[PDB]
Amino acid sequence: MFEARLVQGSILKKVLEALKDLINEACWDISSSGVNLQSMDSSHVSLVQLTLRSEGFDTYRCDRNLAMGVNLTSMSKILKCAGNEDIITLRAEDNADTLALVFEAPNQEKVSDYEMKLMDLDVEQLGIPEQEYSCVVKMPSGEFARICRDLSHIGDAVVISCAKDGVKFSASGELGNGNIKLSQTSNVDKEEEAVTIEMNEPVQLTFALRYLNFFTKATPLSSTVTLSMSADVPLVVEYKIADMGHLKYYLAPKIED
């Protein structure tokens, strides 16, 4: 018997939008420590991991661990019937091939009850060696998404390069070429819309912008985003879900060596 309520159900809406276009089915692992999701897209180029921990919820309860397999498009369609002010409760029996989503207006006598049919999944967790990255660029989220969307119009691939003083995104195509140079905010120390870099090692790598512009569906979740990069390893784009945990997109580089 699983029950999770959020007074601020906006977050659930945002997650599903951040996900629905990159992946279409995924298995939501529920346990008493909270909610966990790891699924790959159709071309196994990108991987997403979602952690919402139990303490973030206003009400959490998980008698027996669950792996519920969820059509994410179905789920987003339902979640678009919730208001941003709505209080959202998730409920599912031990077995039950169904998930209930309940949405209540804080401040009106309106209550919505949706029963989402689940699906038989069984994915198989990949394992994510946890490690140190040559570069970690923390910047504003709107900005990263502006950069990804603009350079799309130049080319199909972006080359991201990092040293101690800033990062640069480059791209090429029929049109021409272009480079955007972002520099470490020297204001910093206690600033909000900054750019800060943990370079240990110059990196320079190359990713498809298609997947990057899927990741920036996550923008509404946090004012700020981080890119972790190292020589021969997928890139991590991370959005912190204030007070609950995080969404991490992982992306396999383009390479010829």
Binding site: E124, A157, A252
Partner: peptide, 16 residues
Amino acid sequence: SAVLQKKITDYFHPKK
């Protein structure tokens, strides 16, 4: 062009 796209599986493997 300039390269080719790796998969996420070439880097992350089934859970020990």
